[PDB]
Design an enzyme around this catalytic site. Structure first.
Site, PDB file in Angstrom:
ATOM      1  CB  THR D  12      -0.909   0.060   1.238  1.00  0.00           C
ATOM      2  OG1 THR D  12      -1.481  -1.228   1.480  1.00  0.00           O
ATOM      3  CG2 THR D  12      -2.022   1.044   1.015  1.00  0.00           C
ATOM      4  CB  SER D  45       9.275  -0.432  -8.288  1.00  0.00           C
ATOM      5  OG  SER D  45      10.281   0.471  -7.882  1.00  0.00           O
TER       6      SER D  45
END
EC number: 3.5.1.1
Lengths: 310, 310, 310, 310
Positions: D12, D45
């Site tokens: 999140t 990422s």
């Protein structure tokens, strides 16, 4: 070769008569286009007036209306080139390239920047891809929109920037790289027409700072300004003094435009405060727009809409 | 742990009185030091006045002269914090940290920046490495010098920047990284002592722009300003109307300071123009230095030197 | 007048041998000081090697130890000048000015920037106020610190910038304005002495990016690198493949330095990741510091401290 | 209300399950649109791979092809969001808004930025005016084109910038201000189709610096890279070593793309050097494009044209 007319508004930006000493200073220019020099006016841009800018705009509209003219290049002082440029950006009804060019160093100085600026300007003015991009200001390898570009430094060669909008394109290695198309109205899609106009409304700019004086509003009101652009603190914030000054001006039918002195950004709408908001127009730009808006209407809502779309 | 006094000048920048809502909103701060909260004043920075900034400066000199006070954090609005901070930059005679902290988003807003800016501010104020650096403005993980920092954008969180001078340092991962030490006079080495003063000489800022009116000079003059800071076009360039307004001001005992509206850079000396030059002080900073200078003298040679050294 | 020795490392940046074409191209320089030209080397900065930068550093320490030498100006290509300048930043044991000057446009180009950058460089090198500031890079009216400055753009004249740290100073109107003093170790206070060294430890830089391969680590390792600088994603973030490559490197005696490809900022310590962190040294600067560090030790605690203090 | 699907690719970015803890963290989001959360993938990422990016692109193309979907919002780590975004920027055949959103601070941190970023992202995704603007990355009140935006700082909230291209628009006071439309091909006007694609070509990136090793080219060649992006010195400059390395790769049919490590700018064409040039694509972007180009052709001239128009 493109037919490009170069209009000078001051002394030469390259070379050691006037627009000719310039056209000779950089031969390579004649390889990019068949140029024609014209000394439209002749003074330090800090002395450029709306009357002359208005004449310049009409002159350029006139030139672009002919088939033997492919684009226009205007040499101009760097101090107010952003004001003059935004004016034509809003009043030249043509997709033909209109390029303002300036230099930060005198043309006789060592490493003078004028010669490369002119060449780049002419390249951009004659390139087919430059059509319909609004008025542009070329200098230091960059192409900035008249609506966004501004002189951000008093003395450096890289002074012109649009910190949040970036440049439209750049010229590197004699090649134009186009990056953006601005998402605003201009030139051919603009409602500001200068055909037959003889003068512009009076709009002055007042600075916002600690202890700002309420009397300058009075002075402005008493001298009949049709509009007041406020280079406000932060996001157009107004002190109690400035508010009393604006309320006063609003009663006298003066249009109050709240901008910022910060240098960049959005002055958002705020109903708790007087006047209109400038969106991302800086004071100098907001004044040029406010004047042209008034040559169309005094309606506060229509003017605000102009400022959110021009 | 260090003894830090948090001085508030407006509402709270953290949490949902005033200075205590603030100190309890960020408990983590009680870990970095022992804080005492004092509500110095309470108004939006656009309404902060020289007279109050003057009292703040004396209140801060007073606190820092106490052995039980290691540093001070001052919450302030973003709109004029550069004006206030620079004022204290020149008038606080201490090496103890004086950190102004602001917040671009309201305390109760989603992703409010105040909580963190306050924590960084307290950490900077309490770090032993922070001594002797001049007044600082802490916000958005950066530490800017009061002399160079300015609000460059109307509404963004990253609004504070010193394009040409950078930040004194930054705070990443709860650690302070010091990059620069300004090469200017300030605090303990400043000649400006405002102990006891109640009011400061009146200084106005007039904008430079195409068609700028001479009458605004007449107005400031007639109202008794003692100094006029000129936010000029480019490098303090003046129009024939502004020059006339400046000469009138000189012939009336008003000191003239030529700055720039561009937002950055050096306004160089020009023997061919009237008035003093601001070096790299923007209009808002220049006004603060000129006011303080005028409590000491009106000698242009001396004031010019202040602007090259402070 | 000051005694300045101009050292060339490539072709001339001013005029149409080499160092004399240069010194005679800008006669104005002979006004700022007495210059002697020495052609140190001759190749494009993309071919400048650690071994030669090493000889340059010794040649410069040698010249500056002479009473008849007040400062040194070194012409260098723009592509790797930040690497060379930072090398000398850490190895020249003198307070006399060491100014690297470059040119973004070829000497014979229209509006070449070399003439002026050289003049400013000489002026900075000869100014008595320039002492003890560390190695400087002078170009485009700016004076950047070798530790922070970097070529941020491929082709523009304003390419050199220190976004977060700014410039030590600037040169406007033939005058030097000093803004900052870096808060780092260098020159006379640096522990790095390369007197006599012939070669430096091998350091490679590997890029961080989606799908980055482990094999590039294996390759550098197998070729005997002594250190690997990692231009990582964000704050030195490593992928599972890069981590494996880093652990392999650690298990093979190669020191690992985590930097960033972003171009600016702090790479913070992370106990959960392998290798050292570069503080705010970009990949190119980090490589230079790590090579020099490795001639002194391989102690990670010591090398980490160097990166937080140099 | 617009129907907007939010695809999460990691943990999140706001709130304390997954894309749901996020959708609950910011209620106001449900006032801008009828949202639907979907946890597409789940990792840091820096661990995002072309295989997943390819799946993400196909997933999004699939979602946008339906009428019950008005736009898509993708939460993503900040380290490689520019790579993932540029990939979809080139492979999503829809004018429907595709907005990538990220946060620089953990969602549990003080003054976490995720909540405001998401809200802005959703606003931009559901606004009618956002159509046909290519893929966008929203964070810190800014809207950047996937083709220009990049993470420029390792750790600051204002890290994302397009120094020379500026932002497409900004979101201030809950209003979207659109500034530019990029002048490049993308989404609906892109030739890169991912329908049926299962994998992407191998493209690695090699850094350029003083003493760069020729052996990494060999290693890359020996591991069968179909392409090599070179984060070159200055304007893609290559040392003798890097040239021997490229010549070698060109013989083996490897496509060599010369970019820059500087961070911004044009790497201009240059026939005296090997490989192709990246225009203004930075290494990370140039790699994503080079891969997709190869899924279309290996012709050096067509690929170069892609790089000058995408």
């Amino acid at each position: 070769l493109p037919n490009i007319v170069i209009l000078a508004t001051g002394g030469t930006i390259a070379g050691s008569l006037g627009v000719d000493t310039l056209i000779n200073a950089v031969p390579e220019v004649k390889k990019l286009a068949n140029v024609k020099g014209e000394q439209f006016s002749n003074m330090a841009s800090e002395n450029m007036t709306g009357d002359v800018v208005l004449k310049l705009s009409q002159r350029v509209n006139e030139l672009l209306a002919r088939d033997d003219v492919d684009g226009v290049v205007i040499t101009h002082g760097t101090d107010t080139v952003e004001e003059s440029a935004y004016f034509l950006h809003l009043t030249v009804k043509s997709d033909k390239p209109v390029v303002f060019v300036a230099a930060m160093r005198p043309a006789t100085a060592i490493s003078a920047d004028g010669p490369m600026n002119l060449l780049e300007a002419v390249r951009v003015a004659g390139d087919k891809q430059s059509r319909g991009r609004g008025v542009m200001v070329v200098i230091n390898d960059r192409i900035g929109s008249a609506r966004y570009i501004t002189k951000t430094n008093a003395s450096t060669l890289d002074t012109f920037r649009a910190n949040e909008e970036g440049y439209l394109g750049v010229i590197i290695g004699n090649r134009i790289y186009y990056q953006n198309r601005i998402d605003k109205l201009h030139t051919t899609r603009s409602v500001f027409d200068v055909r037959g106009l003889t003068s512009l409304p009076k709009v002055d700019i007042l600075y916002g700072y600690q202890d700002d004086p309420e009397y300058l509003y009075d002075a402005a009101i008493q001298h009949g300004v049709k509009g007041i652009v406020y280079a406000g603190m932060g996001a157009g914030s107004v002190s109690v003094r400035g508010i009393a000054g604006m309320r006063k001006a609003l009663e006298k039918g003066v249009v109050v435009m709240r901008s910022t002195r910060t240098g960049n950004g959005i002055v958002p709408p705020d109903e708790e405060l007087p006047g209109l908001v400038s969106d991302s127009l800086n004071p100098a730009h907001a004044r040029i727009l406010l004047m042209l808006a008034l040559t169309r209407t005094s309606d506060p809502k229509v003017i605000q809409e102009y400022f959110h779309t021009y």
